[PDB]
Amino acid sequence: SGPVPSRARVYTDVNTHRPREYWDYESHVVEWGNQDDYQLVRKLGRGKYSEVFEAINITNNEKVVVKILKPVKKKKIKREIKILENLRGGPNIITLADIVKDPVSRTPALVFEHVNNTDFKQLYQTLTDYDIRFYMYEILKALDYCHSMGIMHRDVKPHNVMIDHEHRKLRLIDWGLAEFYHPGQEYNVRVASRYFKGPELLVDYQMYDYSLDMWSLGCMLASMIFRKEPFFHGHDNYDQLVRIAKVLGTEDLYDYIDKYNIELDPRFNDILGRHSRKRWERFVHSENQHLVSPEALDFLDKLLRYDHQSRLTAREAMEHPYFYTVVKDQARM
Numbered sequence: 001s002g003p004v005p006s007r008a009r010v011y012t013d014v015n016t017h018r019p020r021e022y023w024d025y026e027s028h029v030v031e032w033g034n035q036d037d038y039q040l041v042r043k044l045g046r047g048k049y050s051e052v053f054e055a056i057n058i059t060n061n062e063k064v065v066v067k068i069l070k071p072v073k074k075k076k077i078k079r080e081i082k083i084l085e086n087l088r089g090g091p092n093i094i095t096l097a098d099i100v101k102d103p104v105s106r107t108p109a110l111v112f113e114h115v116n117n118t119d120f121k122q123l124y125q126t127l128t129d130y131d132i133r134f135y136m137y138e139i140l141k142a143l144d145y146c147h148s149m150g151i152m153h154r155d156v157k158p159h160n161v162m163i164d165h166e167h168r169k170l171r172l173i174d175w176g177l178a179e180f181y182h183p184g185q186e187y188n189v190r191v192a193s194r195y196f197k198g199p200e201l202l203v204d205y206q207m208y209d210y211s212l213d214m215w216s217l218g219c220m221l222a223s224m225i226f227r228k229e230p231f232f233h234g235h236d237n238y239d240q241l242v243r244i245a246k247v248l249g250t251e252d253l254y255d256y257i258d259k260y261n262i263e264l265d266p267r268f269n270d271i272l273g274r275h276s277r278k279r280w281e282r283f284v285h286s287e288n289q290h291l292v293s294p295e296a297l298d299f300l301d302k303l304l305r306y307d308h309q310s311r312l313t314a315r316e317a318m319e320h321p322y323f324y325t326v327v328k329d330q331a332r333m
């Protein structure tokens with residue numbers, strides 16, 4: 001028999017209740033602007049799918065970020081545009097300002113309202129306890145928002161969090177792997193960066209949901225409170241599940257496999273072995289103990305579960321005692 005079907009615990013049917021045109025990005029008609037409205041100033045970065053530049057809008061002299069898309073399926077480009085348009089104005093979501101083509105090359109580009117190219121990866125191994133809680137809460141605002149809008153990011157990692165530490169402002173960027181959640185849809189498991197991949201991706205369980213982002217968030221949290229980058233340090237996608245199994249234990253892994261009737265790749269048969277579930281105290285030492293509290297460990301434990309349905313939702317996470325002082329200070333301000 002096949003894998004047991006799965007549904008999101010929250011925001012299950014939000015796209016069903018929308019007009020077709022909200023989520024049917026293949027049918028979306030883009031009005032392409034003129035990249036000659038922008039002059040590129042300098043290169044910020046370069047991923048697999050894009051080169052990113054600081055630029056000037058010559059019309060209003062405003063600084064913007066231009067993301068030149070490396071050639072790719074028209075389908076992926078419409079998906080990213082539609083998701084960015086749907087989420088525009090959401091808390092801690094990057095703002096799409098324009099969609100343009102170079103008049104000569106006809107290469108498509110996305111124009112975003114300016115953010116500094118200071119990613120969380122550059123800052124997140126040097127934060128105070130309070131600032132980890134503060135920025136984690138800001139990321140949760142973006143995730144609860146996109147999940148509530150029927151979208152999963154699928155590439156949550158420190159590089160995709162841009163932070164202005166001076167102004168205590170955060171933006172979740174790079175929506176190029178994001179998808180719409182539809183109940184019963186089987187998704188591509190070749191998403192996310194190795195160290196942040198949820199167990200569903202690693203065992204090829206395709207009927208996943210928003211909870212994938214909550215695993216990635218747990219990987220980030222573990223890295224930061226333990227000063228261990230990355231927390232799960234696999235050599236490849238097979239060894240990645242072994243690194244998880246040595247922490248979360250094999251009993252819960254095989255119970256998860258059984259629960260969803262997952263057909264485990266035979267490569268796993270000799271490498272997973274037999275491992276106890278480790279107490280988090282095992283990762284605490286003199287250099288990180290100031291970042292680790294009962295609150296932090298209780299919260300982390302409820303993000304890093306094999307069973308995607310078990311993980312906290314973004315809103316449940318925001319309700320956790322770990323954030324009580326952040327929530328109190330926000331109200332005060």
Ligand SMILES: Brc1ccc(Br)c2[nH]nnc12
Nearest residue numbers: 044045052065112117173
């Ligand atoms: Br690097 C970098 C900086 C700002 C934005 Br907005 C980005 N989007 N993708 N990569 C980005």
Ligand SMILES: Brc1ccc(Br)c2[nH]nnc12
Nearest residue numbers: 115116162163164169170
């Ligand atoms: Br990095 C970064 C993040 C969020 C905001 Br809002 C920013 N404004 N300038 N630079 C920013």
Ligand SMILES: [Cl-]
Nearest residue numbers: 121157158159
């Ligand atoms: Cl990263």
Ligand code: NA
Nearest residue numbers: 289290292293
């Ligand atoms: Na401590």
